[model samples]
Each structure stands twice: as C-alpha cells, then as structure tokens.
Target: GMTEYKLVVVGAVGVGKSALTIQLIQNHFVDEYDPTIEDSYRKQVVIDGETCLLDILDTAGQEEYSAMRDQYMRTGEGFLCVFAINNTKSFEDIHHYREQIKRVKDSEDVPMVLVGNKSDLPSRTVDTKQAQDLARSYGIPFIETSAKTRQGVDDAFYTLVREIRKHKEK
Candidate 1:
C-alpha cells in the first residue's frame, strides 16, 4: 500500500491550472473539465531507491469558488501555486494564492512550489530572476513550466513531493 498525498494545482483560469494539472494527472484530456475529486493513481517512482506511489490531487480552479478557496486549500498537503509567465499580474497574483493556503492551513509555512507557467511563451515583464527572488523571499522552490511543452513539470512535482516527504520526517 502506498501512502496518498494531496497536491493541488491552482491559479487563474488564464494559466496552467487546467493545462499543467490535466496533463500531469489525467495524462490525457477532452478539452477539459473540473475534476471533482482527488484523481488517484499508482506510479512507480524511485524515492531513495525505493518504490513509492504518488497521489496528486487536482480539484479544479474557478473564481466562482472564491470564498470556498480557503476550504479547498485546507485539504491540500502541498500546493502548486501557479501563474502565467506571460502576464505580470498573473505572477503577482500567486502571492495571494500562497497566502490563502497558509491561512487555511493555519501555518506561516506550507508545502508549496512557486510555479511560473507558460515557459514556452515567456514574459518580458516577468523575468526569471524576478520570480526566483520572490520564491526565495517566500522560502519556496521556484519552477518554470510549460503545459504545452511539459517542461519542468516533473521536476516541480518531484521537488514538492520531496518537500512533503521531508516535512513528514520533521
């Protein structure tokens, strides 16, 4: 039996909340829809040279759930606080999302990955250094990804999981 973990992919509808999450979890799609539950799966991943199962939770994203977002954030063990790299506002908005998770989880620090998405279409306004600096300020790992190209998706995911696993140890 593999221990299950919950990692929510979340951001504005303009970004990779659906695209990145849909690809990473569903592994396939039909345009897309709100996945109403924790989509569970068993994959053999080498954690410390031992096999492990990773459960990724993608519960969908929408502004309709604004008040409910805090409740949803509570259920998450870790969060992929995502934003579009092409938009400065999208990048700025991640701070709010991260804060919501921390508030809901009732902790100053939560398991989080700052995901700067749409690496395929980089933003002149949102530089990598800008995000990296912010990520450091918040003490979270920063990863740039492309839902289209699937770049950094695995690294971002694995890094978060390792952080979760590491957190459990402490």
Candidate 2:
C-alpha cells in the first residue's frame, strides 16, 4: 500500500505561507501577492524515495477563514505552521494557531513543525528566542527559513517528514 500524507501549511495573513509552499512545490517564487480562498489545495512532488504522495492543503490566512482552518486541521496528518520573522503579530499568532491545532488534533503526538519564514532579513527579525520557546513548549521542531533565498526551507520539510516517519515507527 502506498503512504499518503496530507500536509497543511497554515499561518496568518501575509506571513508568506503560500510563498513557502510554492517555493517548496514549484521551486520558484511569485512576486505577486494574492490571498488564498477556502479549499485551496495543490499537489506537489514527494521525492523522499519512499513513493509517497503529498496533498498540500493551502488554507486562507485571513481572519475570516478560521472555520476553514479548523476544517483543514481535522483532516491534516501533518502541519507546518508558518510565521514571518519580520512581523511580530504574525509570530504571536503561532500560539493561537498551535492551540487550535491541539484542539482539532486532540493529540500532542501529531507531527507538527514551526516554520519562521523570511529569515534572510537580519534587521527584520523579531526574536528568535521567543520563537524557539514556542516550539519547545509544543514539543515540535522549529526552523527559520527564507523561501526567496531557499535558506533552511528544504531542511524544514525534510525534517518534518523525518519526524513524522519516526513517530509512525514508534
């Protein structure tokens, strides 16, 4: 039987969630800024050498889509919660997002990863220690990444997948 993984990319509005997803899936960046609507999904390559399939669910980041975020959480097998390193509000929202994920997942064992995007801009960083603390509290892995420069982006996804695989083996 083939293993199928549903990965949800979630974050607040303008946090570069879509850009990170696009960079990972399409291997390119789009300069245009467009908000995602509800039920937005795309298929991406899974080159992990295990013949697995990835269903990449891209949810709306707007406040109005909280219900949609809940829906996605219910079906997601793994989560990638993104935040912008340059934006304090975006970073703060990770706590709320994690709480929602906990409620929806109802299990601390679910594979989740905290991704801090836009790490290329050193002057724009809010606080790395704070972000690390959040990830530590949740017992999930953390990575600071820049989709534009592709810094730590690949490692983030690969690390999440590796962790998920380990959890399954347990």
Candidate 3:
C-alpha cells in the first residue's frame, strides 16, 4: 500500500497560484489574463516518487473564502503558501495567510512551503528579504519560482514533500 498526502495550493488571486499548479502538474503555463472563476480547483500531482493528492483550491483575492480556507487547512497535511514576486501587496499578505493556517490547523509543526511566484520578473521584486524572513520565522523552506520559465517550480514542492516525509518518519 502507498501512503497518500493531501496538499493545498493557497494564495491571493492573480499571484500565479493556477500557473504554478498547472506547471507542476501539467508542465504548461497559462497567461496571467486567463480567467478563473471563483472557488474552482485543479487536479492532483504525483512528483518525486510520491503520490500527492493535491486540491488546488482557487480562492478569491479577498477574505471571502475564509470558511473554505479553514476547512482545507484542517484537512491538508502539506501546504504551499504562494505569492507573486512582482506584487508587493501579495507578498505582504503572506503573514495573514500563515496566521489563518495556524488558527485553523492548530498545529505549529505542520509542513509548509513559502513560494514566491513570478520569479522571472526580476525587476518587480519588492521585498525579497521580507519574504525570506517570514519563511524563516515559520521555520519552513522557501523558494522563488517561475512557472513561465519552469524555474524552481518542482524543487519547491519536492522540498516540502521531503520535509513532510521526514516529519512523518519521526
């Protein structure tokens, strides 16, 4: 029998959440202007020799999806908190999402990965140090990824899965 992991991709809208998920699972990229209806989800992903049943929930940019967010947090074993590197506002909201996960999951030691999306757009980087500091504060791995270029996309998810596997072994 194989062990199954439940993973969630969460972040503000237009922060490349869909792009990262698509790139990781399908190895393709969609334009930023592509329309995504609210409260939709993509398929699961199998990576790094592990079976991950990912529920790529597409939540709204605002706090309207807080209830659904709580439900997902409670059941998710692994999480990737995503944000756009080109948007400072999106990066700044990382803490809020982190806090939401903590409050809903009530587990400080849960496996999480902080993802800085849109890494291909270097000129728009607003606060790289702050993103790193936040990830360090949560004691989780962090990586800047670009689904457009397929850069660091797989590594980010693999690192988190590896970390979760380590925790489960203990």
Candidate 4:
C-alpha cells in the first residue's frame, strides 16, 4: 500500500495557491475554479521511488473560509507556504500561515516548504535572497515556482513529501 501525505497549500489572496495545486495534479493552468474536477484534489504519484498519495487541501482565498482553517490545519501533515514573488504582502503573510500550522499541530518542528510562486513574472518584489533567508530561518526548504510555465511545480510538492517522510522518521 502507498503512503498518504496530507498536504496543504496556503497563502494570501491572489497568490496562485490554486494554480500551483492544479498545475501539479492536472498538468495545466486554470485560473478559475471548475466544479467538473472537484474530486481531483487527491492525487497519487511517485517520488524518490516511493508512491505518494497527496491529499491536497487547496484553501480558499476568500477570508470567508476562516471557519475551515483550523480544521484543515489539524489534519494536514505538511504545508506548502506559497507566496507571489511580485507581491511583498503575500510573501509577508507566509509566516502567519506557518505559525498557525505550528499552533494547530502544537509542535514547533513541522514539515513545510516555502514556495515562491509566479516566478516567471518579470516583476518581483520579493527577491531570492530574502526568501532564502526566511526559509533558512525556519529551517525549511525554499523553492521558486511558476504555475504558468510549470517551473519547479513538481519539485515544490515532491520536496514537501520528502520533508514529511523525513519528519515521520524522527
């Protein structure tokens, strides 16, 4: 039997969390939500010779979904803290999500990947160095991804799966 990874994609509004999630599972770009593929949230793939079942919770951008935040956070095994490279506020919001996860899990050390989305864009307010520094401070992996071009998309999710594996060992 394959192992299941409860992964969560979290970020501020308009940071491409859904785009990144759908890009990984669907292998394409979708800016708007489609009800036809609602059941596609759970995907299976191989990473490092191990079959991983990624149960992704692509959280809504609307603040109205606040009621669902804690429930999902408690169940998620790993998190992809996504932020738009062009938006500094979105980047700044990463810590809040990380903090919430930690609080919900009641543990300081949790599996997480700091993701910088929309990396293919020409405008970038959050540079690599700062993002790298932040990830380093959190002692987590950092990756830049472009959902439109599919750059580092797989790496982001795969890295989180790896992190979850390593975390389970300890």
Candidate 5:
C-alpha cells in the first residue's frame, strides 16, 4: 500500500505559491504566475525511504472564492500557508487564512507550514523573528524559500508532508 495526502497551497497574489506548487508537482520553474483557479495536481514522491503520492491544490487568493476555499479546506489534510517576505500585508493575511482553515476544518491543530517566499529578493519586509514568532504561536514550521533560486522549496513541501504523516500517526 502507498501513502497519500492532500495538501493545499494558500497565499496572497504573487507570493510565489503557484510557483512553488508547480515546481513541486511538475519539477519546473515558472517565471510568471498566471494566477490560479482551484487547480489540482499530483505527484509520486519518496521521503524517508518510503514511496508516497501527493494531491496538491493550488488555490486562487482572491476573496471572491470563499465557498470554493471552504470546500478545499475541508478536503485538505495539510497546508502550505505562503507569504512573501517583501510584503507585510501578505504576512498579515496569514492570520485570516489560518482562521478560515480552522473554521472550515473545525480543528484547532491542522498539519500546516508557514512559508515566506521570495527570499532571494534584496529587501525583506517580514523578518525571521516576526515570522518565526507567529509560526511558534500557531505551533507550525516556519521556513523561507526562494523559488527563483530553487532554495528551500522542496524542503518546505517535505516539511509539510512530514507534518501530515505525524498527524496520521495520532
């Protein structure tokens, strides 16, 4: 038997969520994000010497899709809550996303990872301490990634996968 998990990528516009999602599922780098509309992708991957399949949902960040988002949240077992390091509003919006997921899933502790995207950029509006503290308060993994440089992207996904596995162990 093979293990499978459903993970959703949620974030604001241009925070590199789509980029990260395509990179992880398709193993390609996309320079421009065409914006998403509830696209789902799949991939077979190995982690910790085990074979597994992943179902990933790359969602549009627009608030117009509240009902659609709730449906996705209900099915998602794990989440990559992404925000760009150069944007404070993106960082701030994570709180709203967290609340929405909790309300939709009806669970306080969900398998999730907080991602600060575009780390290769020169100026960072959200510092490590700020992001780390928020993630700590929520009890989740905080990671910084650069999609252009292909840094920490796989690590972020693997971290979320590991978290989903842990939740299953319970």
Candidate 6:
C-alpha cells in the first residue's frame, strides 16, 4: 500500500507560513500573503528509500480563521509550528498553537516541529537558544529557516515527516 502524509504549516499572522510551504513544494518563495486563505498542495518524494505522498495545508494564521483551525488540525498527521525569527509575539504564541493541536487530536505527543522562519532577516528578536529550549522542553525538533534563501527549509518539513514515522512505532 502507498503511504500518504498529511502535514500542516501553522503559525501566527505574518510569520511566513505560506512562504515556507511554497518553498517546500514549488521550490520558489512567495514573499506575500497577509492572512492566507487556506491552500493545499501535494508533492511526491522519497524519504529513507520510501516513496511517500505529501499532502500539505498552508493555513491561515489570522484570528478570523480560528473556528476553521480545528477541522484541519484533526486531519494533520504532523505539523510545522512556524514563527518569524524577528517577531517576539509570533514566537510566544507557539505554545497556544501546540496546545490547540494536542487538544484537538486528544493526544499528549503529536509529531511536530518548531520552526523559526525569516532567518535571512538582519534583525532577529527570537534567539535560537530560546527556540531550542522550547523545542527541547516539548521534546520536538527545531529548525531555523529562511524561505527567501531556502536554508533549512527542506529539513524543517522532512524532519516532521521523520517524526511522524518515528511516532507510529508507539
């Protein structure tokens, strides 16, 4: 049987969630979109010699979409919790996002990644150490990414996929 993974990219408004998703699927950066209207993308890739289909959802971070969030959260096998490197509030809001996912999934441990995006920016307010500490506390993987430069972009999503695979063992 073929395997398919449902992954969701979630974050606070203006945190580059769409950029990261587009970069991963299209290999190009989409530098714009305020309060994204939900979009889905599909890609086929090989991971660890296993061919997998990836169904990705780029979600709206705006508060207006909160009601719709739970619908997708329930379907996602894994998630990329993204925050802008230069935004303090975005980073701080990560816990709520994590909480929501866990609450909706009704599980304590969900496959997820703490992603700090817009790393290419010259001014960064969120420290890597801080992000690392949070990820460590949650026992999840953390990656800093630059959608413009595409650095650590692939690793963020791929790591989440690996996490989902590892989680299935239990």
Best by lDDT: 6
Clashing pairs in 4: none
Candidate 5 is scored at a TM of 0.94
The clash number for model 2 is 0
The regions of model 6 sitting more than 4 angstroms off are 62-67
TM-scores for the candidates: 0.81, 0.86, 0.83, 0.91, 0.94, 0.94
Q: What is the C-alpha lDDT profile of model 6 across 1-170, one tens digit per residue?
A: 57999999999889998888889899998867667477889999988898999999998755456657777889899999999999999999999999989999899979999999999998999999999999999999999999999999989988999999999998
Question: lDDT tens digits, residues 1-170, model 5?
Answer: 59888999998888998889888877778998677555888999998888998889888865575787677899999999999999999999999999989999999879999999999998989999999999999999999998887889989999999999898888
* Full-model lDDT for every candidate: 0.74, 0.78, 0.76, 0.87, 0.89, 0.91
Output the lDDT of residue 77, model 2.
Answer: 76
Candidate 1 per-residue lDDT, tens place, 18-93, comes to: 6776666556533555544434344546666656666665545553667666766777788888888878887888
TM-score of 4: 0.91
Q: Kindly list the per-residue Cα lDDT of model 3 for residues 1-170, writing each as its tens digit.
A: 34556667778778887777778777889886453454445445566766655455554454456676577678777788888988888877888888878878887778889999988985776577878898888898999999899999889777777777877997
| lDDT head-to-head 1 vs 6, winner | 6
Instruction: State the displacement of the C-alpha of residue 109, model 6, in Å, after optimal TM-score superposition.
Output: 1.3
Considering summed lDDT, which 10 consecutive residues are worst modelled in model 4?
31-40
* Model 2: colliding residue pairs: none
Those runs of model 2 whose alpha carbons end farther than 4 Å from true positions after fitting are 38-48, 62-68
Better lDDT candidate (3, 4)? 4
- lDDT per residue as tens, model 4, 100-135: 889988998789999999999999999999999999
List runs of model 5 lying over 4 Å from the truth: 62-65
